[PDB]
């Protein structure tokens, strides 16, 4: 069972979220939780919540048995970006994109 979970329009870049994702790709779920737990990045907490939501999905909706359960596929696509304005000076406008990301965790067992 593939059984996936995800977080859409998360406030982080993707470039940032990846790096945390990349630590987890392919591990036994058990390890990932520990890994994330001692990884001092906001994207860690994000990815965790998703991973956790995924397990609970796999658990309550499909087979379950988390013990034999690995994060087989994880990626983050870049979401829509919120345009803002600030100004650096002389009136001379700066776009600044508050970039967002679509975190996605697929936690199966084969």
């Amino acid at each position: 069972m593939e059984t996936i979970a995800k977080h859409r329009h998360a406030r982080s870049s993707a470039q940032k979220v990846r790096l945390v994702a990349d630590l987890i790709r392919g591990k036994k779920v058990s390890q990932a939780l520990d890994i994330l737990t001692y990884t001092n990045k906001k994207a860690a907490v994000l990815v965790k919540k998703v991973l956790e939501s995924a397990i609970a999905n796999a658990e309550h909706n499909d087979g379950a048995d988390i013990d034999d359960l690995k994060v087989t596929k994880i990626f983050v696509d870049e979401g829509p970006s919120m345009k803002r304005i600030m100004p650096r000076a002389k009136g001379r406008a700066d776009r600044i994109l508050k970039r967002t990301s679509h975190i996605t965790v697929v936690v199966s067992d084969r």
Binding site: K83, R84, R92
Partner: peptide
């Protein structure tokens, strides 16, 4: 967005006279 005001100056300004 709301986000839409550009009053781009004049070049910017300082220097240049580049020998005549």
């Amino acid at each position: 967005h709301i986000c839409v005001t550009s009053k781009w100056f004049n070049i910017d300004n300082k220097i240049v006279d580049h020998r005549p």
